[PDB]
Amino acid sequence: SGAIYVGNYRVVNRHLATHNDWANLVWEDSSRDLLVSSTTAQGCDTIARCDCQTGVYYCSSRRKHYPVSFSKPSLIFVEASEYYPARYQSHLMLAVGHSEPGDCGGILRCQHGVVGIVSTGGNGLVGFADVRDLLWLDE
Ligand SMILES: NC(=O)[C@H]1CCCN(C(=O)CN2CCOc3ccc(Cl)cc32)C1
Numbered sequence: 001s002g003a004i005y006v007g008n009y010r011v012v013n014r015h016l017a018t019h020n021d022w023a024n025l026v027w028e029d030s031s032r033d034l035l036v037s038s039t040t041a042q043g044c045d046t047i048a049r050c051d052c053q054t055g056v057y058y059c060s061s062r063r064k065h066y067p068v069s070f071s072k073p074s075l076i077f078v079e080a081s082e083y084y085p086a087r088y089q090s091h092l093m094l095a096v097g098h099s100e101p102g103d104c105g106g107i108l109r110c111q112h113g114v115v116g117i118v119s120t121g122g123n124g125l126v127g128f129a130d131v132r133d134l135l136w137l138d139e
């Protein structure tokens with residue numbers, strides 16, 4: 001679980017979105033595993049606009065933050081679940097670090113702000129859905 005609150009928006013993993021999120025839907029993309037919904041309260045999370053490949057993510061399964069080196073956003077294949085069939089997930093970044101089901105929604109941040117959220121992992125890896133290209137989150 002976990003979300004990004006920036007201005008009048010809430011960014012969550014699309015597979016974890018609520019009925020309220022869908023009733024106030026702004027944009028969603030199954031290929032990215034993202035959904036953005038509108039909010040009445042003001043969010044103060046700052047989104048990074050950069051090409052950083054180092055950052056710190058929150059890992060709920062360890063209740064700890066971990067520093068990581070991560071790859072640049074790309075199309076990477078993902079297995080199958082009660083949420084999606086076998087597919088390539090776009091705008092995905094990988095890092096060597098611990099993650100297990102339940103860690104989705106954990107924020108990844110660099111010195112510039114919020115980079116993305118945990119969306120997949122396994123075998124000593126962790127995958128993050130990038131949000132740095134969604135320039136409209138800020139205006
Ligand atoms: N982005 C997706 O398609 C996700 C949707 C939820 C399910 N997905 C998983 O990867 C589930 N899973 C299995 C392997 O071990 C893991 C370790 C860390 C994490 Cl965060 C998830 C998993 C795909």
Ligand SMILES: [Zn+2]
Pocket residue numbers: 048049050051052110111112113
């Ligand atoms: Zn940065």
